[PDB]
């Protein structure tokens, strides 16, 4: 007779490209059917890439120009309130200040997922956030979220600046290329390959969230909304007549890409 685990893991992928919001959503899903447990899990891994889209947005003439740049990236999961299913774990579990996050997720047998006596589910979460932090947004049993926010940046060997830096002469110097350059304003922004790659290429989330469902529940079909967000600031530069001066407007634009996914706990499928 069978003395192994009594667990099966079924894994698939849904991928969507949102052209308009420059987002490549790549969701992996893994149903964990531990037949020795009255509940049944689902791990939803949110990867892909949210493009940074660091670009000259506005030009008022030679002497003023604005640059849209990404101040934060967000991923949010949300079950509706009427749904029977619940959130039981998430990864990262807490804020992350290091430049890399990495965790290998295993199943430890009583609706328990950890980051010998373990079932591998085949997920090693990994991402990078040079110059940014990860903040966990107040989780509940129906909602969880991470925001990856800008924190800090050296500019051509000049002192780390951030979103609120101020100098009475040059103002906020975050993406100021030169203090006295005789180019036009649109040409006076820092080359994006001198900053974090999150500003140019963008951010590639790799978060996980574990959802649990009672076997004994007449409705075995759950909806869930997944949101990928990009928040952009407006970094302006103008000529004062003797130099460049920068200003930074926080959170002026928010690009948001939402999708509702359908979970079928009997078929162990998740559809677009």
């Amino acid at each position: 007779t069978d003395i192994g685990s009594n667990t099966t893991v079924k894994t698939g992928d849904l991928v969507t490209y949102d052209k308009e919001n420059g987002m490549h959503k790549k969701v992996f899903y893994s149903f964990i059917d531990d037949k020795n447990h009255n509940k049944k899990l689902l791990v939803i891994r949110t990867k892909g890439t949210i493009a940074g889209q660091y670009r000259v947005y506005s030009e008022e003439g030679a002497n003023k120009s604005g640059l849209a740049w990404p101040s934060a990236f967000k991923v949010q999961l949300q079950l509706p309130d009427n749904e029977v299913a619940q959130i039981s774990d998430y990864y990262p579990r807490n804020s992350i200040d290091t430049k890399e996050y990495m965790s290998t997720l295993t199943y430890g047998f009583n609706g328990n997922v950890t980051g010998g006596a373990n079932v591998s589910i085949g997920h090693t979460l990994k991402y990078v956030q040079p110059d940014f932090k990860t903040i966990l947004e107040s989780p509940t049993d129906k909602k969880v979220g991470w925001k990856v926010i800008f924190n800090n940046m050296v500019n051509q060997n000049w002192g780390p600046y951030d979103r609120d830096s101020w100098n009475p002469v040059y103002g906020n110097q975050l993406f100021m290329k030169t203090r006295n350059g005789s180019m036009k304003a649109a040409d006076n922004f820092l080359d994006p390959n001198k900053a974090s790659s999150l500003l140019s290429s963008g951010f590639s989330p790799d978060f996980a969230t574990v959802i649990t469902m009672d076997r004994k529940a007449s409705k075995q079909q759950t909806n869930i909304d997944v949101i990928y967000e990009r928040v952009r600031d407006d970094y302006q530069l103008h000529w004062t007549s003797t130099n460049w001066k920068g200003t930074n407007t926080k959170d002026k634009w928010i690009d948001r890409s939402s999708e509702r996914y359908k979970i079928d706990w009997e078929k162990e499928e998740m559809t677009n």
Partner: antibody, heavy 122, light 107 residues
Framework: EVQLVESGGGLVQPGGSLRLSCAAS????????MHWVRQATGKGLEWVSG???????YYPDSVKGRFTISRENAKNSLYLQMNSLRAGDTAVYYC????????????????WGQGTTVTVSS | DIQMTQSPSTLSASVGDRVTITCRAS??????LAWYQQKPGKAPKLLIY???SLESGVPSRFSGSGSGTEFTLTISSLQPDDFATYYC????????FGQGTKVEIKR
């Protein structure tokens, strides 16, 4: 202990020139913006000139073209060359240090000297 | 050429009083405003930066508020050490001090 000591200054005929200096001690001089600020007897503080950590200089219109601020990090000392003085420039002249956060937040003029008096008159 | 006007220019108060000084800029300066205390024949001390943030040494009875054009400094419970002159200073665009406000002793 952090300290700034102004010196130079005294009587000058209107039209004449003069040179203040400031010795700084107890911190890394080269890494702070520095200012001169003046105060005529009985009156308010008036910003006179500033100099950035990279040697870039800043002036209000009241002195522009007449005063020059300078820096000499090797001697931990700040200077003010005052030309074409007038009665209006009569005041006590202080030396002051800016302080910033590690990420470039400006606190303000953090530490001041005791001042040195300049009197411009016939 | 940002003018700063403080008001009132003189105010009298006794210990315990809650005094408020006002500073007005001739154009917007966001929240780039600082406050200094000065006593006779001494050098100024920095009290407040970014219109409401307290400099490290400074007693918590001091506090500040404002944005744009009008700013106030407030001493919640005046002490003997607080009778002095106070100066606001704008740093949105170079530096400008207000003309000063003397807090005198009422009798």
């Amino acid at each position: 202990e952090v300290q700034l000591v102004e010196s130079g200054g005294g009587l000058v005929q209107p039209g004449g020139s003069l040179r203040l200096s400031c010795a700084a001690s107890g911190f890394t001089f080269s890494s702070h913006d520095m200012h001169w600020v003046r105060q005529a007897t009985g009156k308010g503080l008036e910003w006179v000139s500033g100099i950035g950590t990279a040697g870039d200089t800043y002036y209000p219109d009241s002195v522009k073209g007449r005063f020059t601020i300078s820096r000499e990090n090797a001697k931990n000392s700040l200077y003010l060359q005052m030309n074409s003085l007038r009665a209006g420039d009569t005041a006590v002249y202080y030396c002051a240090r800016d302080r910033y956060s590690p990420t470039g937040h400006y606190y303000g003029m953090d530490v001041w000297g005791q001042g040195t008096t300049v009197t411009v008159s016939s | 050429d940002i003018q700063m006007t403080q008001s009132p220019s003189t105010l009298s108060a006794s210990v315990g009083d809650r005094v408020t000084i006002t500073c007005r800029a001739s154009q917007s300066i966001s929240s780039w405003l600082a406050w200094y205390q000065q006593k006779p024949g001494k050098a100024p001390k920095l009290l407040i930066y970014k219109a409401s943030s307290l400099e490290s040494g400074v007693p918590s009875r001091f506090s500040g508020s404002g944005s744009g054009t009008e700013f106030t400094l407030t001493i919640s419970s005046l002490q003997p050490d607080d009778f002095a002159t106070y100066y606001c200073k704008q740093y949105a665009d170079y530096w400008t001090f207000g003309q000063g406000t003397k807090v005198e002793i009422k009798r």
